[PDB]
Amino acid sequence: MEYLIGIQGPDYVLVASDRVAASNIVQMKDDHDKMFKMSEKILLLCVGEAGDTVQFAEYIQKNVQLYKMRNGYELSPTAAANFTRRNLADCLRSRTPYHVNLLLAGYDEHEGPALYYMDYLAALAKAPFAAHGYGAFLTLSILDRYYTPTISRERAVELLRKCLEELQKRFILNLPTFSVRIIDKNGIHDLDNISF
Amino acid sequence: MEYLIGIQGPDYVLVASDRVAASNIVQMKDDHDKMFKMSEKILLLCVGEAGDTVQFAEYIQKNVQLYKMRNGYELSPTAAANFTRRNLADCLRSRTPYHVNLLLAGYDEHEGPALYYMDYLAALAKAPFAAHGYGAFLTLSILDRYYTPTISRERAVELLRKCLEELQKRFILNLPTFSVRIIDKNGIHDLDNISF
Amino acid sequence: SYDRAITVFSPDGHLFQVEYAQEAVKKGSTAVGVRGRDIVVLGVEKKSVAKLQDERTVRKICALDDNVCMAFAGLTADARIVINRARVECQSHRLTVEDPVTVEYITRYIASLKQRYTQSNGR
Amino acid sequence: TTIMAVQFDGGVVLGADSRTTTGSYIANRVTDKLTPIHDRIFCCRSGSAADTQAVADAVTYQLGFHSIELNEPPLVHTAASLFKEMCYRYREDLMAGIIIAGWDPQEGGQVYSVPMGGMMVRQSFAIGGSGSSYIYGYVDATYREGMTKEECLQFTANALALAMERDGSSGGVIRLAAIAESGVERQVLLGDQIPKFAVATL
Amino acid sequence: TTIMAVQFDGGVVLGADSRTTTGSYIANRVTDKLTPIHDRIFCCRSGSAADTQAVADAVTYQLGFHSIELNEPPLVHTAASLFKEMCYRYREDLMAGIIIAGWDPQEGGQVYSVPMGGMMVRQSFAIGGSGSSYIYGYVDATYREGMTKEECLQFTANALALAMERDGSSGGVIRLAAIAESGVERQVLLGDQIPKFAVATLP
Amino acid sequence: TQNPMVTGTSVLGVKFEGGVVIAADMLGSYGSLARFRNISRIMRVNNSTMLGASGDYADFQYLKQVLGQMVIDEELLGDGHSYSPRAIHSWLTRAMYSRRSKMNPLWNTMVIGGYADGESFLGYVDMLGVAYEAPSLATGYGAYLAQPLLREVLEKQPVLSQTEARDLVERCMRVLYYRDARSYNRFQIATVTEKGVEIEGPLSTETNWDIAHMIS
Amino acid sequence: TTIAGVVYKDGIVLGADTRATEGMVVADKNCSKIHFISPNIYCCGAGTAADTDMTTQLISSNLELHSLSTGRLPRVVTANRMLKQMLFRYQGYIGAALVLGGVDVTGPHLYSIYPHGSTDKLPYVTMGSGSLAAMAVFEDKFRPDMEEEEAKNLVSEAIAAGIFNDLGSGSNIDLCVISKNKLDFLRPYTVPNKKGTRLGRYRCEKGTTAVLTEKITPLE
Amino acid sequence: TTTLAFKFRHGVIVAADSRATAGAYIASQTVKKVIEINPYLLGTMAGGAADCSFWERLLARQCRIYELRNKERISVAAASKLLANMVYQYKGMGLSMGTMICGWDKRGPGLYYVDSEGNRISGATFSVGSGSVYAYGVMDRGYSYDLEVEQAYDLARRAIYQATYRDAYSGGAVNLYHVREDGWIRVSSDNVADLHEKY
Amino acid sequence: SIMSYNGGAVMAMKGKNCVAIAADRRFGIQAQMVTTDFQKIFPMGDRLYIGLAGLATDVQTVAQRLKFRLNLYELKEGRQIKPYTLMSMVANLLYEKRFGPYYTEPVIAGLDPKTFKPFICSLDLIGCPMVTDDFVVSGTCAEQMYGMCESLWEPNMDPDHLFETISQAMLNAVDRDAVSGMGVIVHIIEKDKITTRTLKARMD
Amino acid sequence: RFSPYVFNGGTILAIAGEDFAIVASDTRLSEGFSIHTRDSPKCYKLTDKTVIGCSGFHGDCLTLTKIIEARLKMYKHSNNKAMTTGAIAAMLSTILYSRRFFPYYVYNIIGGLDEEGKGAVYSFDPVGSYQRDSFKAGGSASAMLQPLLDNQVGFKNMQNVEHVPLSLDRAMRLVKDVFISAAERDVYTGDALRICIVTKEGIREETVSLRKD
Ligand SMILES: [Cl-]
Ligand SMILES: [Cl-]
Ligand SMILES: [Cl-]
Ligand SMILES: [Cl-]
Ligand SMILES: [Cl-]
Ligand SMILES: [Cl-]
Ligand SMILES: [Cl-]
Ligand SMILES: [Cl-]
Ligand SMILES: [Cl-]
Ligand SMILES: [Cl-]
Ligand SMILES: [Cl-]
Ligand SMILES: [Cl-]
Ligand SMILES: [Cl-]
Ligand SMILES: [Cl-]
Ligand SMILES: [Cl-]
Ligand SMILES: [Cl-]
Ligand SMILES: [Cl-]
Ligand SMILES: [Cl-]
Ligand SMILES: [Cl-]
Ligand SMILES: [Cl-]
Ligand SMILES: [Cl-]
Ligand SMILES: [K+]
Ligand SMILES: [K+]
Ligand SMILES: [K+]
Ligand SMILES: [Mg+2]
Ligand SMILES: [Mg+2]
Ligand SMILES: [Mg+2]
Ligand SMILES: [Mg+2]
Ligand SMILES: [Mg+2]
Ligand SMILES: [Mg+2]
Ligand SMILES: [Mg+2]
Asked: I47 vs chain H: nearest CA distance in angstroms?
């Protein structure tokens, strides 16, 4: 079951997600990616019910890309977050609600890095770090303990690696590998997978 | 969630069990032992509902030991399996049923090695190999594919290790270590834990 | 069910059934125990001799658990009851305390069983 | 509720108790359950007060309009048919047990039952509502072919009084109406004017 | 079922229909629902047939034994009391609506109702069973203080006939009994003997 | 009882100078059917105490049987001690609580009235063992319809004469007959004073139906 | 809530308490339950508060359109029909229980209107959780053709009965008196309930509350 | 609630918050959730407030009787086992209890987790209660068998603190105990508002 | 209960020529705190604020949809909305969803844009309005809030005393509620300025 | 399904002073939307030194208090002394637990003098979880009373205030204030406030009027 994490530093946001797709008692894929690139400087990380997660993320992704094509420039992380929220909330009481939980990470030229948390109800919160999934219960306090607002990216990846080690130790599910990416002024960078 | 496995060769039975005690989303112990020594040449491996499992296994254990003290010699693996089954079946429709699944492994001076399977309903089957838990779904066919009745103990531990690797690869739960023991004419021998 | 008071006081404070039970012990085969420095030994007389006897079947020294044994003198049938009761109790102890009994614990248990059979109706 | 109507040569007599209950609270003790649908056509209402009021208002509208268009007084049979259509069509959303009675020049005095479910049947006399259960035997034994208007009025008042004594959901005053070519005559029996039959003491 | 009993000066009249149903199948069309509990004490039974038979058989036993011990005929009030005790105590496990009626030397003709739940009340006349709902009005309008035996018999037959016409769960024949110091007189009204009241076909 | 069968509606009670008056109609209803129209829902317990019961009449009859036997038992001793109204009310509290606690209640709400040692006693006990005392009581629909009238009079004049209490009870019984669909216009009034317990009836209230011509 | 009305010799008296509750807590000690319909017609409301407010406002507005069109003073029957037809359509889901009273060219008229759309035309009515207490007063004391002051006494007594005997009712008694000549909207009519006074003082001086952050934004 | 305990070189650390709730209502900020069973044995309380208090008090009674009969201190194993056997009979009846039994006996420092579901397990470290998941993260990242005494105190205190911060149902003060070979000591009681200031 | 899924508390309070509105700062999901700076009070004018407790998603939707409507109103009309009119606008917005409501129960606090007269109100989730002359409260600790307000509030308080009263009412109320707190924010609204403060508060 | 419980309302409060205890309650007994009586106090004298407040389901309040009374006499007969405030508290915990599976629907607060003569308050949940407190509210309006006591008696959330001892006169003023506030908002609290003051001289009683609506 699905784990998302984000940590925002002074000029970047780091994000990671597990790579498992499971079904019943089996992992069916171990290189699954739960991140969706919305624009040069925006990732949407999406977990929840099957079908809803991809349908929702891809719809958001295509509309963000459409906005870019229509206007010549991109939606800010904050605008995209609010766009995402409006869609989810507008569907909440409709015949087609989407059961998805999200993180939105981005870097804006003028606002700097941003990390947004959203639940399936479409409550939106800006946070210095955040996580979703049952794994969040075991890692949020690790983040509260060691995060600082000026944390460097070398130390953020170390902190991330304490969180992921804690899941190996203490979480009942087998989540042995994680996708890791960072966003800053120069866009989206793939880091090495963190594996056990 | 709990895994038990047994493989019987010509003159030994090999058994292994996971070492996790879990509660809700957390492993609370990673060196748990699910094996109970009934006599010099009998192990009972027990999983199922909390409380029931230990209360049942220890009641059996004490009674087997009492038999030894009363009579000067030990219950055969077969007799112990049947005793175990009588008790479980007798409780099945009572006010105090025990929700436990078992393997009984033993070596008898005159019948040789034996492996018995029992479910919570108290159906008793003798088997050349067997397993309990959701992990069984992913390992039984591995045993059907490679087991032969003359399998040597060196090859049995290898076959056990293919099963346990399959759980690391494919099972959704984090079971990283296993107790392993063998029983033969010289009693019960602890093997190294198999760990990941 | 039979509720007669069997063991009762007599005028000079005696419990005659108990004294008679002691007479039964005195006619049993001799038994001796000696506590060594790092050994303990039990030895006991006869039972019969009797060439046709299967010796194994009449031992008067009995394991109660792995770390405790006992000899007795007196009524052998009575002893078998006490021994079995003690054997059961050694397994409860291990069950609930996860240690073998001390010798004192099981001695105390046996003694208390014996005292009860001097103060209970019908026995 | 208890409602009743009876045909005689030249007209009809209608009656009802006046109790409206929510649970076992009496929300109106002097209810008028006999509602005029046209000059000489009434309906007696039982069941949900909201339902029977809504249905009766609607039928009054339909019948009035129909009557103007035709330039003739309406048929009692037509009034009953309009009730039936609405009570049958909406039988799953209404709790209405109706008696339609009145006079027209073509067929004289007529009584129709439209019970729950929305069937319609003409009868010499009709009873309905919760209290009607307690007067089947009475009306079966007492009814006589060829009663006068005055006899129909007494027979009605008696039946209703008996129902009212026994049915917790019926009571209050007895409202009567007689309808004939000459018009509608309404009256109320109250207190000591309600027929009285002793409790059977030892 | 419809059951009824009526007091007169010197005794009682009891009546019942004869229909026993399972669902809407008539399993007995000629049921005898008036059961003798002693020489001059009967009960009229409605509700579960199994229950009322069991309770009646038990009371008969109790009352008979009590009567031998006392060496006197039993009080009607005593029969009613025994029914009440058993119907009240077991009110959660029985479906029994009973009328006890009879004669004794001390109190004469007497009618007691023991409806479901096991209360007990003396009455001038009593009705019960499913069909009784349809004759409350009739009996209330028709009852007169001081009716003779023959009038009580007619009044009973008429009430039961009316109930039987309307109640799907009542029907068949009318069983009547009169009880007095002289004894018990039983009769059956069938077919054309049952009082008849026209269906009110249209003029 | 799990499921009440034949039932009674409201019982009223009010204290006055020298006694207590209680009232109850004579109806046992079977659902909405007014089935038994001449039954008394009031008991003289002993000389100082009376009881009125709402709810299941078979359960009331049981209580009457038990409590009647207890007063006889006590009179057999002829020892100068008698159960006071307060004691009877205590006993009844325990018995209702105890039955409630076995999940098998006696399906009743009761009003106990008494007069002993110069004091008027009026007490309430319900099927759950809820019990208390007050200057006036009303069970069932009486709690909604009669009690507001009783308490309004008693705020203007806490101490009523017997005849004033009696007139007030009659006014309440009228209201109940107008507004409770399980009521019946045939009731009893029971009074306890120095002289003992008197039960009067059958009584009826005059009713007014003028409003039938004011459909307004 | 306790709401009520009476027809007296020359008009209508409407009455209401002023408690609104959420669960078993008092949310408003002084809410207004006697709602304007037209200058000659008012309506007390009980039940779901937003439903009573919105229902009466809508009908009042449609009646104003009606009267603007006709040039005449509206009729009580018209308000009754409009309310009951709307409530019927909604099948009881609009939880408005109303006492409607006024005076029109045909004189005084009083109706009770239930959520499911039934109405009763009667010379006195009560509604709300306090309605039986108020109705007891009316059954005991109403007479036809009372004088104004007697009718106002009777209605306030009836509301008081609900106030004191129903946990759902409280605070003040409001009345509205409507005749051919006069509209007297008496809010409050009586204030039979008052908060007791405060015996200790908790005038906590500046600095008592520790402050983490402060921003003053000046305005024009 | 959040409770934790852990064995280490210098014995066993035991810590708890002090909140009690009734639904979402905060009933108390000053509950004592570490019961002194005897001068070498502690029990911790999480779950139903009455259930924990009653059953640990009963355990204390029984351990004392044991001591009187047998003339020696009950072991941690035996005490934990007495509790497990007492509650086992009530499974399915809605008792809610999660306890750590913490002592030092002839086998050295001892720590057992025991609950109303029937679990009884020995281990190095545990956390129990609505806030346990949060305490585990922090305890797990800082735990070592070779912690110095003051470092172990700091860790326990911090773990409970961080649990009170995330978990709506944990709060108040952190109460800390230390089981040593000659008995437990009460180390400190620190209000979570004073700890926030500090961390 | 839907209304407690997120927890939270808002209140408003009247003083002489000033009003105050306050909120806790926790955004949580059942037991789990997610953030501690979640906004619940929103400007609807220079001297007019709305506070929303209830389900966080609906807090945000209502605030946003209300702003949409208000901005259109102010562009079309000459002028800044009156407090009472804002209340009505909000009532109408909430009652449109009568049969599938937003799970939020707002409080409004402000000064009339022309007269500077103080106004406070609250509404239930389907738009029933309630104006008062003292205070209003909404959220998972409403009882606690009522108890503090009833005991401390007095008439005609100056801005400093109003700030202490509303602050002590909030802090002490939320400290008896598991799912409200993690901070308190207070806005004092006066004719010539807004003063915004966060309070030292328990963080458990 | 017969329900064996009903809610009958009622608010209780106790405060410990240096040499006094207060136990206070309203006098309203309710059921549904009706008032049974306006004169039904929730305080019960147990000894000269101990008073208990009980609210919730009145059938259980009556039974439990009669059980406590009987147990106090039994204790006195076997042990030759009156039960102390603390022993009454410990005993009450066990009596409440004995109904763990069919609870007394009662909220109990004990107020009295401890063995040094000092104020003692003990508060309970329905199944007997308890502790000693300095002050405590219970019952219907407890959530309304408690925060204000936290603030004004506990001095919580206040800076630069001298934490003085609680005088009897101040504690009395507070008690009356909080009940008056509660009567404003809790529909169940009203009619009258009954106050018991336990000191070494004995137990004295004040009553004050509350709103009747
Ligand atoms: Cl052992
Ligand atoms: Cl109607
Ligand atoms: Cl019908
Ligand atoms: Cl019909
Ligand atoms: Cl009907
Ligand atoms: Cl009526
Ligand atoms: Cl037949
Ligand atoms: Cl039969
Ligand atoms: Cl019956
Ligand atoms: Cl019957
Ligand atoms: Cl039948
Ligand atoms: Cl009768
Ligand atoms: Cl009597
Ligand atoms: Cl109309
Ligand atoms: Cl209402
Ligand atoms: Cl503490
Ligand atoms: Cl022991
Ligand atoms: Cl273990
Ligand atoms: Cl917990
Ligand atoms: Cl640390
Ligand atoms: Cl919108
Ligand atoms: K009737
Ligand atoms: K038939
Ligand atoms: K109040
Ligand atoms: Mg879907
Ligand atoms: Mg079980
Ligand atoms: Mg049966
Ligand atoms: Mg409908
Ligand atoms: Mg809080
Ligand atoms: Mg917390
Ligand atoms: Mg009130």
From this structure: 34
